[PDB]
Chain A
Amino acid sequence: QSLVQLLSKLPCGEYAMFIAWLYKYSRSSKIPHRVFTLDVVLALLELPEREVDNTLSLEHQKFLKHKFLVQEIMFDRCLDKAPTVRSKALSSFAHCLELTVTSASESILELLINSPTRCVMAMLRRRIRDEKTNVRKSALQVLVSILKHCDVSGMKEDLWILQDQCRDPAVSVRKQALQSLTELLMAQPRCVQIQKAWLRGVVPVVMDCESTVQEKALEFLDQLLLQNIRHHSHFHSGDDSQVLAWALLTLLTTESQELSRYLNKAFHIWSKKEKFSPTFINNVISHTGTEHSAPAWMLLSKIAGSSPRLDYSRIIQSWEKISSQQNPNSNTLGHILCVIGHIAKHLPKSTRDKVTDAVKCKLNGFQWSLEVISSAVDALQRLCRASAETPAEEQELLTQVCGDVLSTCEHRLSNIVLKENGTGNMDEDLLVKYIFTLGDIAQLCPARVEKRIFLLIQSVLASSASVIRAHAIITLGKLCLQHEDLAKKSIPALVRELEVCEDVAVRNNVIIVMCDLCIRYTIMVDKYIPNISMCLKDSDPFIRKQTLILLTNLLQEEFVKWKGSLFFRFVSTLIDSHPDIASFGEFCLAHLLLKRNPVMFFQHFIECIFHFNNYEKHEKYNKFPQSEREKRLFSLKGKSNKERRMKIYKFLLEHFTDEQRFNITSKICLSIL
């Protein structure tokens, strides 16, 4: 303040030579002197541009320009060699750039960020890799200060980079980037791709280990979506909070739907917190008349299930209208069926009878996709549960209701499959959905399946030597989940079909089936675990990543006692050519296996060394059996294989801690040597 007043007292020439001396003094190596000089350069930049003195020299006239000042000083200040100096330099840079924004000197911004070929995207890419967090905080602040006045057209990749800094694992980085994106979406309301990248950024925030930034995301989405839309009579296009929330759920339809699981977790928090309201029910019922109700209906998929206390007749009428209609959106009808199932405890039988009759007639219609069939059959399980209040009563009612469509589709399969079949005399989709309907029925009546059905689907299996065959194996698995005798009869044929058949999709389905039989019958399919271990070496990477997901689900519950061969497979799968699947493997072990138990690699290291060395004569260990097929799959040895050996070894070293490193150095220098 005193300098500013004295500079107002100072003439332009005295100011000019004094800026010359201060620019020379900026090259002094004193760190607090440099900090003070850059701070008072920022103080000078708080003032507007000094009046142009044509009597002064060219070196003095160039001091007057603020563009030349920010080109000379803070270009070197942001590119210094000290972290705190660069931190304060970037803070002063953000302050001076918002100062140029308030002085409306956008040409300075274009000259720095997009100079005609020093690139500010490049130095920002440097700043986000800096160790210091507040350097990245100043960097995100200055890159969100820019482009609030300009369109994103041509530079949506900068926004893509912005949710890449939302990825940065610091509390303050997300804790300020979330506020930055929320003020971005209200800076301009009308850009679809900004909202798309926004929702892609914000839906993995709430899975963080830290709880407060998760909650700040939760109520920020509450004020963005829950606290925007009003009653439909109150709703107006001018009320753009409602319009923005409607557009945001319009972007929730067919774009990203895994986030509904995060929404289920969030509503689980608000079910613990009981933050759902009957006023919200009144608002969504008021918006049932709108055509925007379909994402509101899938929001109601679990929200309405908490406490059904109201009248839902208009919803039943709309469901009847779209069920009489033959080609709706499948998601809309499925969500309407699940909300009907969730409110069925309050609904009377006087509507439930005609609902079940309409279901029965349209099931005889067979006018749906298979996802709608699955939603319908679980919803009809809900309708039988709400119909009955006795286990015997729901048993008998579900038995007869499933028996009707069971005998119907059983008669259809006897007319088609048991009779002669041409190459193109059938529609594949009709028969596949018929078998899927019978599989859902046999899921819902395990007591009503007979040995004639067993030999029928065994004859279907006998028509092997494709698309229908894998689904037949899936339905066979659903049945043998309930039938251990059919499981024992089937598993040599299933194991044979695993290592004989050639289509990738049917073997994927066989592995999925027999691993859910592993979840049911671990005590018996523990001997068939090494079939999974040899199937881990597939040609197709999608098969390998799917088996990685299955083995991750097996390891997270810890179904089986831990054997060294399983650990050998966990190590051996990490040399995938595709890096994403392998990195999923290291992320899974780092966030889950290291969390569950830290000492597994400590005992497993020495037998891992022996396993990759083809050494079997150890006195203490190497007692596991081996097959010829896995012997020729495990090309793990030699000069052609040493690189992945010490790559894996140093990965395990960085997994080991310093105390673990000391103890493992003691163990290797005693026992092995």
Chain B
Amino acid sequence: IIPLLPMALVAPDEMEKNNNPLYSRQGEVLASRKDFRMNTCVPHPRGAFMLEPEGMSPM
């Protein structure tokens, strides 16, 4: 019944987000690097980016 869960549906650990914070032009820390999903983008030989390399590749 229950299928596989997509991995992107899980929030990351807080200490990891403390370990990579992102700051501003003024230098104050605004967010973390793991708060955004282009870090989790995966390259393709055609140049595409997908969150899940596991699965059907586009033709």
Contacts and interface: CB of A to CB of B under 8 A. Distances in A.
Given A443-B22, A446-B25, A447-B27, A470 B47 contact: yes
A549 B51 contact: yes
Contacts of B9: 552-553, 556, 592
Contacts of A443: 22, 33
A481 interface: yes
Interface of A: prevailing SS: helix
A265 B49 CA distance: 25
Contacts of A584: 3, 6
Interface string A533-545: 0000000101100
Contacts of B49: 470, 474, 505, 508-509, 512
B37 A516 contact: yes
The size class of the interface chain A forms with chain B is 35 or more
Interface string B35-48: 11111010110111
A182 interface: no
A482 interface: yes
Nearest to B19: A382
A217 to B, nearest CB: 15
A432 B44 CA distance: 13
A180 interface: no
Nearest to B48: A505
A342 B18 CA distance: 12
Given A392-B27, A474-B38, A261 B10 contact: yes
Contacts of A342: 19
Given A374-B39, A549-B51, A482 B24 contact: yes
A391 interface: yes
A391 B28 CA distance: 8
A565 interface: no
A370 interface: yes
A516 B22 CA distance: 15
Contact of A395 (B6, B19, B27): B27
Nearest to A447: B25
Contacts of A374: 39
A169 B1 contact: yes
Contacts of B25: 446-447, 482
A612 B8 CA distance: 32
B1 A261 contact: no
A542 B26 CA distance: 40
Contacts of A546: 50-51
A265 B10 contact: yes
A228 B4 CA distance: 29
A16 to B, nearest CB: 50
A504 B8 contact: no
Contacts of B19: 342, 382, 385
Contacts of B56: 542
A167 B2 contact: yes
A474 B41 CA distance: 11
A478 interface: yes
Given A374-B39, A474-B49, A512-B38, A504 B58 contact: yes
Given A371-B43, A391-B27, A258 B58 contact: no
A268 interface: yes
A549 B6 contact: yes
A378 B20 contact: yes
A468 B44 CA distance: 12
Task: Among B7, B20, B37, B38, find the residue whose CB has the most chain A CB atoms closer than 10 A.
Answer: B38
A509 B51 CA distance: 11
A491 to B, nearest CB: 17
A493 interface: no
A513 interface: yes
B1 A542 contact: no
A500 B56 CA distance: 26
Interface in A585-603: 587, 592
Contacts of B44: 505
B47 A467 contact: yes
B37 A505 contact: no
A573 interface: no
Interface in A512-549: 512-513, 516, 519-520, 540, 542-543, 546, 549
Interface of A: 167-169, 204, 207, 256, 258, 261, 264-265, 268, 342, 370-371, 374, 378, 381-382, 385, 391-392, 395, 432, 443, 446-447, 466-468, 470-471, 474, 477-478, 481-482, 504-505, 508-509, 512-513, 516, 519-520, 540, 542-543, 546, 549, 552-553, 556, 583-584, 587, 592
13 contacts: A167-B2, A169-B1, A342-B19, A378-B33, A385-B19, A443-B22, A443-B33, A446-B22, A447-B25, A467-B46, A504-B58, A542-B58, A587-B3
The 8 closest A-B pairs by CB, nearest first: A467-B47, A505-B48, A447-B25, A542-B58, A395-B27, A169-B1, A446-B25, A258-B7
